[PDB]
C-alpha cells in the first residue's frame, strides 16, 4: 500500500565504544571502534591509526569485548546487539582477502523480560570461563565458554539485588567472581558472588559487602598483582579486596561526574578517568611490598592531566597516545606528555575526527548556488556544540586562470635536475606543442631546446639519466638536461606516425596503428627492445610500474578497437597474459594500472563514460572481480595525482570525478567543477601541491580539498544548539542555544551567546540552563546578535516567516517556563522578533498556559502546539497573535508538520494524527488518527496520503488513510521498518544538484547518521524486495544475523516483519558482491527496460547506479 526506500547518506559518526587488543594478529595492537551498526578495526602504529577493516552488523552493537581462550593464537571478539544477537568473531586474513568469521552465535533474549532501565552490561571472565550478561533486572545470564557451545546457550541466575549499577568479573580468583554496585532503600553497596558452573548458581563471594558512596557508579576490576576492585563515585574513589579497604575523597573530581575509565598499565598501576566536562585524570595506585612477595595497595592519587573532547570512552594506545571516543563532540587522538606545558596541561591534541552527532535539528539551504542544497545541522552538546555545514562533492581552490583554448594535454616537467619542484608545464594542441615556464606565480611561454613545437605531444616528462622525453606524432625525442640538446630520436622504420604513447622513467611503449614498439631509456640512447602486431588497432596504453618494482614495469596494459578488449601483455615479449572483453561498439579511451591502499587495479574507461575496473595481479597479469561504474556520458581521461601523501586518480569528463579507496573498495566522488578535459598534477614553487586543469577555452591551476564524499565545515558554538532556521531576507540563520551556568549564576566559559557583536535580554514583566536566540551570518557564521530569554525560560521552537498582510519576516520563538515541581510546564511564551540594524527587536509577546513545543507557518497564520493543544493564531493589523481555533484531543503535541490545509501531529505517546483546517468553518476537523500507541520522536508528511513517523525504539513507520465514518478515522500503518537510529529531525530536501524514486526527505540522528527516505512505485518496490530476498541468501552476515530479523519493527509492545520499506544500504551492496553472486541474484527476475523479461547482472548494476545518485 506504501512503498518507501531508505538509505544512508552519512554513516553514524558518534563513538559508542572502543576496545584494544590483539585481534588481527598476535603481534598487532588493534583499536576497535563501535559506531552503532559499524565496527571499525585499526592497527596502531608510530605513524598513527591504520584502517584495516570496517564491517557493518545487522544490529546495534551493545557489547564489544576482546578475549583470548586457551588454544587461540589471537583474540576473539564478543559482540552482543541491542536485539540480543550474540556472536564470537575471529579475524582471518588470507593474502589480500579479509574475512570476519563467526565462531559461535545465538540469540540470548528471554521470553519474559523488561529491559533493564540502566542498559545491557556484558562482561567476560579474565580466565574465559564464561560471559556474563545483565539484560533484565533480577537476572544474571551466563554463557559458559565451552568450545562445544557454538549456539551460545545460556542459563539465568536469580540476582537478589534488583538494581545493579555496574558489574565486573574480578582477576585472580579460583572461581569466576563478580563484583557489583547495587542500590536499595538503605543506599548503595558493593558485593561479590562466585559463579558456579556446576550448580548454575551464585556462591558466597570472597569478601563481604560494604556500603559505598550514594552515587557510586563504576566498578573497575584491577589485575594482578593488586586484584580487587576500584569503585568510582561523585566525590570518592574506593578500593576493595576484602581484608582490604582504602578510600579517598579528592576535591578535584567533585565538579563533574566521572563517566569513563581505561587502564594505562597492564598491571593496573595507572588508569585514565574522564568526566562529563572533558577533564582527563590519571588515577595512580601505589604499591606496597610484602614479605610473602604479594603486593598490596598503599594509597590512591588523582592528578588532572588536561582537557579532551567530552569522552564516551578512552583507550590508551601506548607511547602516551590516547584515543578519545566522543558521542557529544569530535573524537580525538591526544598525546600525554611526561612534562606539562605553560598552562599546566599534559594533554596535546594530535588529531580530530568529525562527529556530527547528536544532530538535534537541521535545515537545507542553497547557500552558494541555486539548486545546490547544503545541510546545516545543530550538532553536539555543551562545550562541543556546533553548527555543521555539509555539502556533496570535492572543491577546487582556483589560484590561476589563463585564456588558452584548444588544449589537448598537459604534462609537468622539472627543467632543472637539482630542483625537486616542477618549473615547466607542457601543453599539447592539434598538431602543435607549447611550453610554459613557471617563475613564481608568473606563467610565461618559452621554447625548450630539444622539444619541437610543430607536432602534437602525446607525452613528455622527466626520464632516467637526467634526461627529458617528448613523444609526438612524429617521433620519440630524448633530451639531455644540461645543456638541453637532442641526444637520441626514435622513429618507426618507415617514419609512420605514432598514434598512442605510454612512458615511465625508463621504458616507452608506442603504438603505430596495430604495431607496438618497446623502447628503453639509456644514457643518450633510445634502445628499441621489441615490437609486435596486435590483432586490432590500438586505442590506449599504460606501463605504470606498481609495487616494489624499482620503477620498471614487466607489464603493458592495452585497450584495442573492434573487440573492445583490455589486455595485459608481458614485456618484452608482448605475450598475452590476460584479455577482458568489455562489450559494445565504443572503444576504450584510457587505461591505467594503479595502486590503492596497497592493492593493484586495472582501470579502463570507454568513450561513453563507462569505467571498468579489475583487481590486478602484477606477477601473473590476472585481472579479477570486474566492476563497472558510469562517470558521465563522454570519454573519460584518467590521470594519477598525489594529495596529502596518497595517490588517487582524477577522471576527466563532463562529470569530473576523483577515484580513491576506502575500506579496500574503490570510491568515486564528484569534483565540483564544470567539464574538465585534461589535468595534471603540478608542484611548483608558486603553485605547490596543485593541479593544472584545462577545458575547451581555459587553463586553471588550483588546490584540491580533502578527497571524501562530503565536505563538512564546523562552526564551534561552545554551548548546546537546539534549533535552527534560515531567514533568506536577512542572509542569516537563527539558532536557539542553551548554556550551563552555576548558581545569581556564573558562566563556565565564553560561548556563542556571550560573544555576540551585540546582545539583548528579555525583560521580566551543571546547575541552570540559560537560553538564547543567536543570529548568525550565513557567509562568515559570525554571531551577530544574541537575545537572552527570561530566567528559567527554555526556548523550544523556532520559525522564520511572514504572517498575515504584514510584509516583514520575523523570527518567532516558542518557550516554556520550567519549574522543578511541575510534571510539565503550565506557562510559556510565543515571542515575535524582527532582526533589523544588527539587533533583535521584540515585536510582540503572547503568554500561553504551557510549553510551546512546535510551531509551523500555516497559510500566513502561525500554528503552534502547546501542551495537549494545537492552536492556530492569526497575525492582526495591530501586530499581535490572536487565536483562531484550537484542537484538544492530544496527550502532548510535540511535533507538527503541514501541507496545504493538512496538519500532521506527533504525540508523546499516541502516535500521529491528521487534522484539516476547514477554511469555510474557521476550525479544525480531526480526519484520522493512528490508534496504535507509539512514543514519537519526529514526523514528516511525505505527500497528501502518506505520513512518516519515527519513534523512540529506533523504528520508522508510514501511515495512510484506509481507503464507515468511524472507519475513515483510523490511520493504517502500512509501512514498518527497524532503522536502528534515533531520528531527531526530518526535512524535505537533497544534497544532490537539482527516476526509480519520488521525493526526498533527509533525516538527522543522535549518532550523527544522516539518512534519506524516498518513494517507489509498486513495480520498483516488488523488484527491489525480490533483490533483497536474493541478496540475503548469498551475503554472509557477520554474526550470522538475518537481515529480516534486523529490520523487523520492534518495540516492547510488538515485533513484526518490515513492510513497505526497501533497505537501500542492502540494495547498494549489490555492487560489491562477486559476479557469480550477481548471477545468483539475477536469475529468473522480471525487469522492464519495453516488456517484462529476464534481468541480467548488467541491468541491475545500472538500476543500483540510478539509486546511488539520489544521495
Ligand atoms: N573456550 C572457547 C574457545 C574458543 C571459542 C570460540 C568460540 N567460543 C569459544 C570458547
UniProtKB/Swiss-Prot annotation:
Matches recorded under InterPro entries: Beta-prop_RSE1/DDB1/CPSF1_1st, Cleavage/polyA-sp_fac_asu_C, RSE1/DDB1/CFT1/CPSF1, WD40/YVTN_repeat-like_dom_sf, WD40_repeat_dom_sf
Similarity remark: Belongs to the DDB1 family.
Region listing for Interaction with CDT1 and CUL4A, in residue ranges: 766-1111
Recorded coiled-coil stretches: none
Gene: DDB1
Cell location: Cytoplasm; Nucleus
Summary of the function given for this chain in its UniProt record: Protein, which is both involved in DNA repair and protein ubiquitination, as part of the UV-DDB complex and DCX (DDB1-CUL4-X-box) complexes, respectively. Core component of the UV-DDB complex (UV-damaged DNA-binding protein complex), a complex that recognizes UV-induced DNA damage and recruit proteins of the nucleotide excision repair pathway (the NER pathway) to initiate DNA repair. The UV-DDB complex preferentially binds to cyclobutane pyrimidine dimers (CPD), 6-4 photoproducts (6-4 PP), apurinic sites and short mismatches.
Region described as WD repeat beta-propeller C: 709-1016
Summary of subunit composition and partner proteins: Component of the UV-DDB complex which includes DDB1 and DDB2; the heterodimer dimerizes to give rise to a heterotetramer when bound to damaged DNA. The UV-DDB complex interacts with monoubiquitinated histone H2A and binds to XPC via the DDB2 subunit. Component of numerous DCX (DDB1-CUL4-X-box) E3 ubiquitin-protein ligase complexes which consist of a core of DDB1, CUL4A or CUL4B and RBX1. DDB1 may recruit specific substrate targeting subunits to the DCX complex. (Microbial infection) Interacts with Simian virus 5 protein V.
Covalent cross-link (Glycyl lysine isopeptide (Lys-Gly) (interchain with G-Cter in SUMO2)), residues: 1092
Consequence of changing residue 537 to A: Slightly impairs interaction with CUL4A
Name of the protein: DNA damage-binding protein 1
Claim: DNA repair is one of the keywords in the record: yes
Residue numbers bearing the N-acetylserine modification: 2
Any GO MF annotation of the entry: DNA binding
Signal peptide: none
Segments of this protein annotated with the region WD repeat beta-propeller B: 392-708
UniProt disease link: White-Kernohan syndrome: An autosomal dominant disorder characterized by global developmental delay, variably impaired intellectual development, hypotonia, and characteristic facial features. Some patients may have genitourinary and skeletal abnormalities.
One GO BP annotation of this record: epigenetic programming in the zygotic pronuclei
